[PDB]
Amino acid sequence: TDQQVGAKLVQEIREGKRGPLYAGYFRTWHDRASTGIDGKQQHPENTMAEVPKEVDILFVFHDHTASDSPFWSELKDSYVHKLHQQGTALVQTIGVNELNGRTGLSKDYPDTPEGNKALAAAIVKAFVTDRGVDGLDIDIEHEFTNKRTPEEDARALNVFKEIAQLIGKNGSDKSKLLIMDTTLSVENNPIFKGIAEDLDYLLRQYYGSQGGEAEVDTINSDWNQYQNYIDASQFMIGFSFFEESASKGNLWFDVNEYDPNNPEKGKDIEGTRAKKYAEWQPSTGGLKAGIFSYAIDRDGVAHVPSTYKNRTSTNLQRHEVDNISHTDYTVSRKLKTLMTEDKRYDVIDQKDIPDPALREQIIQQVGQYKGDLERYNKTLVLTGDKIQNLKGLEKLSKLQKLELRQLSNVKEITPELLPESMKKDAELVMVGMTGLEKLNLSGLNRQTLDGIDVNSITHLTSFDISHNSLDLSEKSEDRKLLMTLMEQVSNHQKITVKNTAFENQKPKGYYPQTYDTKEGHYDVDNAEHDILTDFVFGTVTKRNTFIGDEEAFAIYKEGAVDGRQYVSKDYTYEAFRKDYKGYKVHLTASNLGETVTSKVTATTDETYLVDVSDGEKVVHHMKLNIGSGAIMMENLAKGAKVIGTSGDFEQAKKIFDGEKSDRFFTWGQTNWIAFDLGEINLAKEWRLFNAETNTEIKTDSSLNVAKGRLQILKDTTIDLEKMDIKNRKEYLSNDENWTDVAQMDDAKAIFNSKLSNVLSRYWRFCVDGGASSYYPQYTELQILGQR
Numbered sequence: 061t062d063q064q065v066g067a068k069l070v071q072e073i074r075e076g077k078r079g080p081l082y083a084g085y086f087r088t089w090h091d092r093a094s095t096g097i098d099g100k101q102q103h104p105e106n107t108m109a110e111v112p113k114e115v116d117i118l119f120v121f122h123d124h125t126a127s128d129s130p131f132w133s134e135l136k137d138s139y140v141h142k143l144h145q146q147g148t149a150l151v152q153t154i155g156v157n158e159l160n161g162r163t164g165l166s167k168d169y170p171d172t173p174e175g176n177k178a179l180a181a182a183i184v185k186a187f188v189t190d191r192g193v194d195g196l197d198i199d200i201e202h203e204f205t206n207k208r209t210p211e212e213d214a215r216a217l218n219v220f221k222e223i224a225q226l227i228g229k230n231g232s233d234k235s236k237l238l239i240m241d242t243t244l245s246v247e248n249n250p251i252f253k254g255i256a257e258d259l260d261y262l263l264r265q266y267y268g269s270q271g272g273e274a275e276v277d278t279i280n281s282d283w284n285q286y287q288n289y290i291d292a293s294q295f296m297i298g299f300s301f302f303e304e305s306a307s308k309g310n311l312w313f314d315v316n317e318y319d320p321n322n323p324e325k326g327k328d329i330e331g332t333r334a335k336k337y338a339e340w341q342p343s344t345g346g347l348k349a350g351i352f353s354y355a356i357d358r359d360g361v362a363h364v365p366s367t368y369k370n371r372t373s374t375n376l377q378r379h380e381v382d383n384i385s386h387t388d389y390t391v392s393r394k395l396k397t398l399m400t401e402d403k404r405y406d407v408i409d410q411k412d413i414p415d416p417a418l419r420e421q422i423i424q425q426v427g428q429y430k431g432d433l434e435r436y437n438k439t440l441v442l443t444g445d446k447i448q449n450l451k452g453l454e455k456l457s458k459l460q461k462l463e464l465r466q467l468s469n470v471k472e473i474t475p476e477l478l479p480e481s482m483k484k485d486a487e488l489v490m491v492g493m494t495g496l497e498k499l500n501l502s503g504l505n506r507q508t509l510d511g512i513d514v515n516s517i518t519h520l521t522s523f524d525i526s527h528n529s530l531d532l533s534e535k536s537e538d539r540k541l542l543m544t545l546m547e548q549v550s551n552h553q554k555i556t557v558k559n560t561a562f563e564n565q566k567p568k569g570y571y572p573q574t575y576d577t578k579e580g581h582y583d584v585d586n587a588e589h590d591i592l593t594d595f596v597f598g599t600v601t602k603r604n605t606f607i608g609d610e611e612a613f614a615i616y617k618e619g620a621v622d623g624r625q626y627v628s629k630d631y632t633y634e635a636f637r638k639d640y641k642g643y644k645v646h647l648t649a650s651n652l653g654e655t656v657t658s659k660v661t662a663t664t665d666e667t668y669l670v671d672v673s674d675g676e677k678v679v680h681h682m683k684l685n686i687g688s689g690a691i692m693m694e695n696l697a698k699g700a701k702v703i704g705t706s707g708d709f710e711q712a713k714k715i716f717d718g719e720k721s722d723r724f725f726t727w728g729q730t731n732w733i734a735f736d737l738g739e740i741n742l743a744k745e746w747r748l749f750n751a752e753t754n755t756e757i758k759t760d761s762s763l764n765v766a767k768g769r770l771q772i773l774k775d776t777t778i779d780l781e782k783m784d785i786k787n788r789k790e791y792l793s794n795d796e797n798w799t800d801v802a803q804m805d806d807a808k809a810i811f812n813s814k815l816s817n818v819l820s821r822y823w824r825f826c827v828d829g830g831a832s833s834y835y836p837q838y839t840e841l842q843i844l845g846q847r
């Protein structure tokens with residue numbers, strides 16, 4: 061039957077037995093069996109039956125064909141049969157709107173777990189099972205007018221995962237393909253991220269130029285992201301043939317332009333983007349799966365000339381290439397043989413990897429093709445007693461982790477059996493290397509000997525870990541492992557500088573993860589001190605060996621093992637040390653005033669809270685005393701209850717929260733807020749954050765308060781819970797009931813001044829005028845003191 065031929069075909073594609081693929085989108089209304097809603101045939105010139113063997117997968121791209129057209133029968137009972145005989149699979153294409161509630165069967169089903177599971181079944185039955193084809197393809201493009209809701213995308217993904225339980229690799233019916241095609245980068249494609257593991261292929265349309273001098277920038281940029289979700293052998297890129305009467309916005313120039321001097325110019329692939337795409341390969345991961353064309357029915361038609369690039373549906377500029385004509389699929393076949401002749405898809409053979417057991421495990425993990433070797437960039441795990449030689453492993457030059465497990469019969473590890481990425485900090489794990497006799501890692505800039513099981517290298521006769529970046533100082537763990545290596549050599553041979561090389565190390569420097577001083581101190585010497593130089597300084601090696609200054613580095617360079625000095629002679633402190641380029645120091649004085657400076661001048665008793673930042677995070681926090689210090693003040697006002705104001709009562713309370721993300725002003729040049737601190741405590745200073753302090757809206761200094769008065773309630777005995785709202789407000793507005801404690805007369809961003817040990821529970825702040833004509837604003841008010 062052609063259900064068992066279909067299954068056999070799909071299983072040979074999914075397991076990668078056809079090399080590079082070529083696929084095509086056939087527009088149903090350009091098949092001669094297609095009829096419109098009228099019942100009239102649309103175009104007799106072409107047919108899917110004629111699609112050659114070189115096309116590996118044919119995508120049914122449906123539009124204009126009516127549902128009662130003879131085409132659907134011709135597809136199911138004739139076309140699929142003929143194409144299966146030459147090894148070609150049929151895949152049905154549907155848009156994502158059939159999945160998210162906007163079109164077709166998705167309007168008839170609720171957005172619930174059982175509803176979406178019934179929708180999935182109805183889709184697989186209507187678009188795969190009943191059409192006779194071998195798989196489904198979901199089209200997810202950008203929606204220019206009327207974007208998709210997060211609820212529609214969350215639905216499309218849930219339906220997609222239920223389809224993937226029915227068909228595809230992770231489905232009940234493994235005989236069908238499950239494909240996605242898209243125009244969306246990973247960042248903009250939540251459905252892809254959720255459905256990737258269940259995909260056979262991702263077909264990413266790249267019609268027209270994609271930026272840069274090679275016209276392929278967006279392809280490389282996107283593969284850099286896509287590679288974290290799918291394998292290269294699942295990635296296909298697409299070009300478009302020239303659609304008839306295509307307008308501006310749909311003119312890609314992916315094939316050659318019309319030539320009046322050469323009618324066959326359209327089927328010449330030299331110079332075309334189609335050819336560039338056939339040749340393009342990923343930088344990482346592996347080799348791609350192949351390429352596909354849109355509108356394969358237009359294969360070989362020359363593209364409309366560049367001078368037509370501006371035609372619209374309103375501004376017709378019809379050309380001879382707008383005609384419909386029969387195609388012999390010449391461009392398709394040339395591009396397919398161009399890809400199968402690509403000598404990068406030759407299988408890895410004994411010439412590349414001589415050891416058969418090594419070659420089996422590389423092929424299992426890296427892929428089949430010679431071109432997969434220089435691209436693979438993940439992990440390789442080599443095990444067992446059958447591997448004798450590691451020749452050929454230097455071809456995996458982008459490997460990120462090499463893991464050697466129980467390689468009992470491997471006698472040699474040398475830098476020329478190792479990938480190039482071992483020189484740029486790739487991980488290397490070795491366990492149970494009981495047969496290893498030569499261990500040469502020279503010149504690979506290795507920062508650690510971590511992961512090398514030195515205890516099990518029991519047959520070692522020589523090693524060379526010279527010219528690396530190792531810390532071999534007394535307390536370093538790498539010196540302990542160096543020692544074991546030297547003892548394993550001693551069992552078999554007299555130690556020599558040649559057979560235990562470890563000199564010329566150049567260990568790189570790092571920032572310490574912490575700093576010792578939680579509490580610093582200066583005397584009151586009337587001098588400037590640098591907080592960075594005194595407390596937050598120095599560098600560490602990878603094994604956390606501290607070096608404080610240039611002299612400590614000089615002592616480090618003279619470290620030796622058995623009188624053999626291991627650090628390179630011309631390695632300089634400037635090269636090892638960390639400059640502290642981005643570093644800033646955030647100080648909070650005892651009156652809660654904030655400044656950003658590394659320098660302090662020790663003139664009086666004071667306490668700072670210090671927060672050091674590197675430009676991103678806080679790296680250190682300490683307290684610093686000058687002299688006897690000073691007790692850290694509290695903001696008495698924080699959370700003060702507002703008891704009355706000339707402005708809006710709910711705007712007023714936002715000058716007593718934590719933030720500067722708000723503003724209080726009135727319809728005028730003057731206002732007052734009166735507030736209650738709860739209890740009565742002792743107040744030594746006040747601080748006002750003016751208008752230009754504002755964090756939610758950039759405010760210029762013309763809106764600043766210029767004159768103002770902070771005040772306490774004259775009567776200490778007064779109880780104002782007794783008088784009622786109308787009297788209370790009039791009482792709190794009468795200025796003869798308050799005494800000036802502080803007077804502002806300058807429009808500074810932050811205004812601070814001292815009080816004379818004010819003990820009061822009721823307060824009022826009056827704005828008496830602004831910096832300009834505009835209504836003066838301010839964001840936060842602070843009364844500073846104890847308890």
Ligand SMILES: [Ca+2]
Binds near residue numbers: 716718719721722839
């Ligand atoms: Ca505030």
